[PDB]
Structures are given as structure tokens and as C-alpha cells.
């Protein structure tokens, strides 16, 4: 019985989801009635019954299991995880709410090889997959642990080779809303990173404006990647966005200027 198996239930994953027959994977924090559906979904699927039973487990050691069974069978069944793609990065986004670290920072690595294989194949995320992945992925960005922060980040920038940048976009903006402060700075250098990278097409004016708002945060390392956001802004846009950063504390244009230049 292999782990996962090649059929083609997707489509009515899919279809269920658009027209409104199961939850839209969408959540603050993810309670019961999400892993009921997931693991009727994946029951459906024909997803090895262990592997299902691990996965829905309450000991993250089974969780660490059921990660190191699929990185295993990923370089010979790879039709399979595409074909159940969409039921593997919503198991995930279970585990970025759990607290253990051994969890995230191997689950991230296999996000990072199973990446890879949609790249290579040039896969193509669903509007679905990209959805419900990318929102709780950008959760931990903010980490306490720096592997777990580096591990996002480089599954982040496989997601937006595969899914569009604009949305990812998007989705990091949302992180400038977070009342946890090292969630907000790493949004920050990330929107720095995308700006730096597809130019600004993918930063809009309003945008710039919210990203200039938190130039006046407390916390210093908020301050700090908010102005090297601007300030590359400012390298792509010139003059014009102090037009787009709306009015500031003179305190800023200074620290900005001071930034600007230096």
C-alpha cells in the first residue's frame, strides 16, 4: 500500500472547496472541524491508512515519522505527492501551530525538496494550494529560532517561482499587522528582498504607504527594516516616494534622509 496514490481526487478536492460543499482551508488558528475534513479528504484519497493515523497523532514524534516517511518516498513516487499535493501542505499548516521545533525545521526541509520537484516538473500551484499554504507558512517568519526563520524563507522563495509573486506579496504585507514585533520586521526585510527583486511592479502605492507607517514603531528593529524597505524604494522610485510614503514625523525624515544617504 503505497504512502500516497496516483489518482486524480484532486479535481474534486478542488470542486468541493469552489462550490462551497467543504470548510475553505482558511483559519486564525486551526481547530477540529479542519482536521476532521482533512482526514476524511485524505481517507477519500486513498492516503495509507498508518500514515493518516500518524499523521492526526497527538506526539510530534509520530509527526516527525510521517515527514521523514514522505521525504523518503518523494524521489520515487512524485507523480503521487503532486497528485496529493494539496492534502500534504494543508497537514503542514497544521504543524506550523504546533510548538516543536524538530517538527517545523523537517518539515520545512522537505517543503524545500518537495519544491524543488514542482519546479523541475514544472508544476503549477492551484489557486487552492497557494491559499491555503502561504498565509500559515508566513506565520513563521517571525520564529524565535533562526533555522526555523530560514527555513520559511527558503520555501517562501520556491512558493513565488511557482505560485504569483504579486499574491505572495500580498500575503507578507498581511505580516505588518501582527502585534508580535519580530513577525513585523521579518515581513518587512522580506517585502525589501521582493522589491529588490521584481522592481516596483510589485509594490504599489498604497502599499509603500503602509510599509512607511511602521517607520514610527517602538520596537527598534521595526524601525530599522521599515526604513531599509523605504530606502530601497527610494532607489527604484526617486523623489516620487515622498509622495507615496504620506506624511511623516520629521523625526523619520531625518532617520530616513540619514538612511538614504549612507
Same mark, same amino acid.
Given at each position: 500500500?503505497?504512502?500516497?496514490?496516483?489518482?486524480?481526487?484532486?479535481?474534486?478536492?478542488?470542486?468541493?472547496?469552489?462550490?462551497?460543499?467543504? #470548510?475553505?482551508?482558511?483559519?486564525?488558528?486551526?481547530?477540529?472541524?479542519?482536521?476532521?475534513?482533512?482526514?476524511?479528504?485524505?481517507?477519500?484519497?486513498?492516503?495509507?491508512?498508518? #500514515?493518516?493515523?500518524?499523521?492526526?497523532?497527538?506526539?510530534?514524534?509520530?509527526?516527525?515519522?510521517?515527514?521523514?516517511?514522505?521525504?523518503?518516498?518523494?524521489?520515487?513516487?512524485?507523480?503521487?505527492?503532486?497528485?496529493?499535493?494539496?492534502?500534504?501542505?494543508?497537514?503542514?499548516?497544521?504543524?506550523?501551530?504546533?510548538?516543536?521545533?524538530?517538527?517545523?525545521?523537517?518539515?520545512?526541509?522537505?517543503?524545500?525538496?518537495?519544491?524543488?520537484?514542482?519546479?523541475?516538473?514544472?508544476?503549477?500551484?492551484?489557486?487552492?494550494?497557494?491559499?491555503?499554504?502561504?498565509?500559515?507558512?508566513?506565520?513563521?517568519?517571525?520564529?524565535?529560532?533562526?533555522?526555523?526563520?530560514?527555513?520559511?524563507?527558503?520555501?517562501?522563495?520556491?512558493?513565488?517561482?511557482?505560485?504569483?509573486?504579486?499574491?505572495?506579496?500580498?500575503?507578507?504585507?498581511?505580516?505588518?499587522?501582527?502585534?508580535?514585533?519580530?513577525?513585523?520586521?521579518?515581513?518587512?526585510?522580506?517585502?525589501?528582498?521582493?522589491?529588490?527583486?521584481?522592481?516596483?511592479?510589485?509594490?504599489p502605492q498604497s502599499a509603500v504607504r503602509e510599509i512607511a507607517r511602521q517607520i514610527s514603531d517602538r520596537d527598534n528593529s521595526v524601525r530599522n527594516a521599515?526604513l531599509n524597505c523605504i530606502v530601497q524604494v527610494f532607489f527604484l522610485s526617486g523623489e516620487k516616494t515622498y509622495k507615496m510614503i504620506g506624511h511623516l514625523?520629521?523625526?523619520?525624515?531625518?532617520? #530616513?534622509?540619514?538612511?538614504?544617504?549612507?
Amino acid at each position: 500500500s503505497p504512502l500516497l496514490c496516483a489518482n486524480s481526487a484532486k479535481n474534486q478536492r478542488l470542486l468541493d472547496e469552489q462550490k462551497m460543499k467543504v #470548510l475553505k482551508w482558511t483559519f486564525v488558528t486551526p481547530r477540529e472541524e479542519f482536521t476532521e475534513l482533512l482526514r476524511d479528504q485524505m481517507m477519500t484519497a486513498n492516503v495509507n491508512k498508518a #500514515l493518516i493515523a500518524n499523521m492526526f497523532h497527538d506526539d510530534f514524534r509520530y509527526h516527525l515519522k510521517v515527514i521523514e516517511q514522505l521525504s523518503e518516498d518523494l524521489a520515487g513516487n512524485s507523480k503521487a505527492l503532486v497528485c496529493n499535493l494539496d492534502l500534504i501542505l494543508k497537514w503542514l499548516t497544521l504543524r506550523f501551530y504546533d510548538t516543536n521545533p524538530s517538527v517545523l525545521i523537517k518539515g520545512l526541509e522537505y517543503l524545500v525538496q518537495v519544491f524543488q520537484v514542482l519546479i523541475d516538473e514544472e508544476y503549477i500551484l492551484a489557486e487552492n494550494e497557494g491559499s491555503s499554504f502561504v498565509p500559515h507558512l508566513l506565520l513563521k517568519i517571525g520564529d524565535p529560532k533562526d533555522a526555523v526563520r530560514n527555513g520559511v524563507r527558503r520555501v517562501l522563495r520556491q512558493v513565488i517561482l511557482v505560485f504569483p509573486f504579486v499574491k505572495v506579496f500580498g500575503y507578507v504585507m498581511e505580516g505588518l499587522k501582527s502585534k508580535n514585533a519580530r513577525q513585523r520586521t521579518e515581513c518587512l526585510d522580506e517585502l525589501t528582498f521582493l522589491i529588490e527583486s521584481y522592481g516596483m511592479n510589485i509594490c504599489p502605492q498604497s502599499a509603500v504607504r503602509e510599509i512607511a507607517r511602521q517607520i514610527s514603531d517602538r520596537d527598534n528593529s521595526v524601525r530599522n527594516a521599515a526604513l531599509n524597505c523605504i530606502v530601497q524604494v527610494f532607489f527604484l522610485s526617486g523623489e516620487k516616494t515622498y509622495k507615496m510614503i504620506g506624511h511623516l514625523n520629521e523625526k523619520d525624515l531625518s532617520m #530616513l534622509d540619514e538612511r538614504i544617504k549612507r
